[model samples]
Target: SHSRKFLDVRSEEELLSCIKKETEAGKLPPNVAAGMEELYQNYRNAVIESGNPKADEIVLSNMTVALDRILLDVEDPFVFSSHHKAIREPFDYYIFGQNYIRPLIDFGNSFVGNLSLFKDIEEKLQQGHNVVLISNHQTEADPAIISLLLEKTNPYIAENTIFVAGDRVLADPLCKPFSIGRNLICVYSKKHMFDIPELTETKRKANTRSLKEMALLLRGGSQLIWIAPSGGRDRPDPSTGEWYPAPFDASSVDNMRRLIQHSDVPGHLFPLALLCHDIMPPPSQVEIEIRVIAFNGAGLSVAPEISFEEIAATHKNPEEVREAYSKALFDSVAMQYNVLKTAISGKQGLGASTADVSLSQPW
Candidate 1:
């Protein structure tokens, strides 16, 4: 019902009025109605307080409208059929996603470390090469944060960037819209491959097709892809409660490297570090308050592109190479993560502990 109401309205003011009407008429519960209103108010206050030059009545008004359409899409989340093909198809970012998600980030505190490396990546892409970012995944906001961080310096990279995502992002109602807005190479992560015993074979078959699709994209050239070799989020340490980049899986790292090597054009795997859990954090079902909240700062950083052959040269065989290469990439991400942490916070550098990564005010 709200999805239809959202689709009916073109402007944020009309959507706000519609929200009031729906709430009073009991079409939308007061609690749910307040959540949307609060999102709108948060953006308004942030704009007014910071004097953000970019926000105006039109952009500010689009916030509520954009949010409702996202809700509308969530209500009718896309489902992949038995033999669906994975490809890149991005919805208009400026129209549907930008306004609603923009205010959730405080850019003054956000920075992209080693920006020149991104420029070089862009050049390589232009020359018909593929760039794969091996990263430590942080949160749902990662894709958006990546786009926003590089947008100013390298709009080409931001707009053209592709993400290697799991089945959940494509299946979950709440995440489908986020998936639709970006270029995704949907692959079943290793952990999710065997979630259902009966579907293991089905999942493997689908993964092969996805891998083939990636081959074609790599052949096409100028693709910027991001993946987390850890296959999931980085969890906090049990005893220390400190967060670090999770250990990358050796086979997963090796597989991507092999895929890149097999591609027609050149491919480079770079280590990417992200510090953005504050926006959409984890702990599963119980912790819902942090969802869609704003934060003061976040961190996005990258290291130099790695040479798999060079790393392989030192190892004895494929078995040893994968483990060593995975470790090297993981170490690169871990190192950059600290540089970003130090730049964004006043905490002690990499090796030592902070009270908590999430406890700091800045990033």
Candidate 2:
């Protein structure tokens, strides 16, 4: 059963029709079916359009097997998605996920900027000060992207960091396997929180619980967390097709800042930008097919730590402080994002033109 071919998808139309049939038969949940169908179609287009079919198809088959094993071979279910801890060697699921995601990352095409800040983040965590990465969300594979880029230089950060995850990853069968492999503080994103009106109250409570879970982790020494203050993934503009980071939610930023302050273990926030969505982009269409889609390149960059204290002092507290603080942070991420875009898309020697952007590529 572990080796069963759960996905033998050959074409987009077949994938769509089969998923539709399965969804209607009550054999598969509608949400899971919907996500899979989209992933299949989009994944197919990505591979087929790459103009190199054979290698992509081979990787796609292997990718499908790993994903299937992650769902069927794993023993644990990540019982508390609200606050799941990292599972190590004893858990084969983590390895399964590593195999599925690692190959998808082409290090030469991926780059990390501001490498010194990662040193700061590492040291802070070692000194028992929690560090939080306030980033813009991009794709489901963002976790793998982060870990892979850092694995060679900052193995500790790569191995131990936790992500603040949205509920879709926890609910979708295809996504659940990936979600279960890492440390996650799962909460519902504002974008999808109201999608099911009946679950509004439950999701609110779950988010509250996730907040508490985060607070507890911060209270414990040597913790590191990654969150998307945008409360959603970046989407390409419909008009220009150029991708941009989604705007950060003021309240969400405030909540994370407040939680760290209240935790009292000494926490720092750094502005982060991700450029890896080209690998497995968010479900604008289908996020993935039964394969791995490689783009020209992917990139991650970090700016200096943000000063909420400075923002609050200038903006003055009470009514409008949160918005001001959020904007300042967003500006830093957006600026760094521009440089990263120039760096990773540098295949044409375009990236060589930039003198200030320091890129670290881990093979």
Candidate 3:
């Protein structure tokens, strides 16, 4: 019955037409209709950019087949609220996400790289210490792909993890299932932060709610929280059209750090460097790298030593503390990212150049 929710659409053209009709009937937002148009255009261009006719044909065919076979619920799963309030069935997450969704992505792209850093977190998780995993956002497929990529070192992490996603995920029906299939906490990411002006207040409320939920979940034990410190997807540089990490969102990282510090359960933050954007299409062996920010969590010894017991302790300037902690966390990830980028580009010639690295938080 769950699988029956997917509409049997055969092509991107059909999918776009369906969404447009839905938009006209007041079932979907006009922006979603516009988004679908923009996305398909980009998809076509990406396939073309592969620079090989057969590669383009194969990629488009694989995408169409994947979309028809697995897509579900062409409408928003959480239409009433910006986030899903119900608990996800872990069985569904592993089955649909790992068994069905990931294989389909693997059909289009091969994931390669090493992330021995996760082995350290796996050890901590075995010791019953909660963990928070942070990285940069790239595509809608990231949630499933990240979990699948970690399977070699940490097989149980995917089923046991909960993700914090952007509220816009609820608006795009195509991106909805990835969030729905996992235990998710939603936030109004300031990247695409708001579609209309009036939704600002609504977005603020949803973000507050997500932070409180994240705090509770981490304290609940046996849980792994995965988030992107950069509040939204990385954008291409205007001057060169090359992809680079956006300025790390100090406020977003600060909020998450504060949540972990205040929670009763002792938890550690694990930074991940993802170099997987190149694998989105054209069906080639993709060599995406995933590495830990620090091998043993020793680098984060300076993290604020506050606890729930210390919550009542007054701070002369709370914002200052948050900024310091946030900056520390971002620097740790960025340092490792720079190293990982160099290693990948040197070895595989797949990543952006060194000049793309931003030394300061531009924002």
Candidate 4:
């Protein structure tokens, strides 16, 4: 099968290749792939068949039509960046965190336990270390809460962290403004990235540029960056009676590993598990108690030759490595929740033991 056979997902490279193939063949461009799953499966099947001895020759060298137009959008898609920083003196900067926002966040956490959770978080934020805040993919407001806290903790972090998110946010007219105000960079996850294992020269270049921007923010003395490792909202699993992590593009997560590998001052990878007890979270599939769990314990040094393949393979295979990371996050909040509950239940006789508090539930 030709490259066109896997037109279900279009990445920067796939889109470029498709446009070029059309131009060279003197054919008009047609939208081939619109979703990632179809593209990924088809690509896998095609590659498997190609390795078969009886397979016919499949050439993918065509540069069909003038693909420059398509390249324009692919190269520089408009994002909601209305919140770009100005260089003029006396900044017009609008702070996100205030009494109102803090009170709301406090109220949200109140259902889980005492107001001290916010204090604990703020104290951690004030420590002045680079934080890769990983939260369960849920409501859009979750990110906003992080932003609000950062602003509230102002004078602590010189520069605010960037939010690495999905590209679909650009499609929403109203959401675009708020996202722009926050100065977020929405990472595009095209199905083609999975379909085509190898990224073309052009796509690689763009990704390199994006990664550089992120590096500057981190390296320039910023305290943290917020990213969802799962890359989407969490959903409640009826079968297990538990919440299941959202499915995300492995390629995207791998890209993060790549950025860390190349970073000058390597950053720590902290996985945050966010659970809510009251008020169904907006982006999540089901309602549940929320815990802003923080993971910490294991650590690693960055290497120059590290590839996404190596980073992903190691983390996925050795369950202990991933588990240690998950445990740290759960344990932190679990410890806090248990401490608070003991105080509330007048279980002073229980001797402040965390043995009974199930990390499994928000109670």
**Which of candidates 1 and 4 is the stronger one according to TM-score?**
1
**TM-score for each prediction?**
0.77, 0.81, 0.64, 0.45
Q: Tens digit of lDDT per residue, candidate 2, span 1-363?
A: 232334765654554565565557555567666656555555545545555446466446644554444335232344555788766655555555665555455556667887878998888888999888989988887887787778778888777889988777666567666666788888888888788999999989988888887888789978888999887789877556677788988788788888888998888888898988678765453332223355447778887887777777887564578898788889878877777777666463235424445676755
Query: In model 2, which runs have C-alpha deviations exceeding 4 angstroms?
Result: 1-61, 70-79, 89-91, 283-292, 346-356
Better-scoring candidate (TM-score), 3 or 4: 3
- Model 3: residue 225 alpha-carbon error in angstroms: 1.0
Query: Model 4, 245-307: lDDT tens per residue?
Result: 455444444455456556655455444434332112333333343322111111101111113
- Better structure of 1 and 2 per TM-score: 2
Candidate 1's residue-wise lDDT over 239-358, tens digit each?
Answer: 565677998888887888788788868888889899876565655432332233545457777778766778889999889888888998898889878866765563443323333222
Please name the candidate that would achieve the greatest lDDT relative to the true structure: 2
| Candidate 3 wrongly placed segments (more than 4 Å) | 1-72, 75-77, 80-114, 190-197, 280-321, 348-363
Summarize candidate 3's per-residue lDDT along 1-363 as a digit string, tens digits. 233211544556666666555667666567655655554555555545544455455445544433332233443254524335333554243345454333233222232223344566667777777877766665566666666655555567656666777666555665554455666677676765566788888778877776676666667765677788776666555555555455677677666667767877768776555544443421112222111010010001011222322432444467766656555556655655554445443342224223323211101
Predictions in order: lDDT: 0.69, 0.71, 0.52, 0.39
| Cα distance off (Å), candidate 1, residue 167 | 1.3
The RMSD (Cα, Å) of candidate 4 is 18.0
Q: How many pairs of residues collide in each model?
A: 0, 2, 0, 24
Would you give me the overall lDDT of model 4? 0.39
- The candidate 4 region of ten consecutive residues with least summed lDDT is 294-303
Best by TM-score: 2
| Candidate 3 clash pair list | none
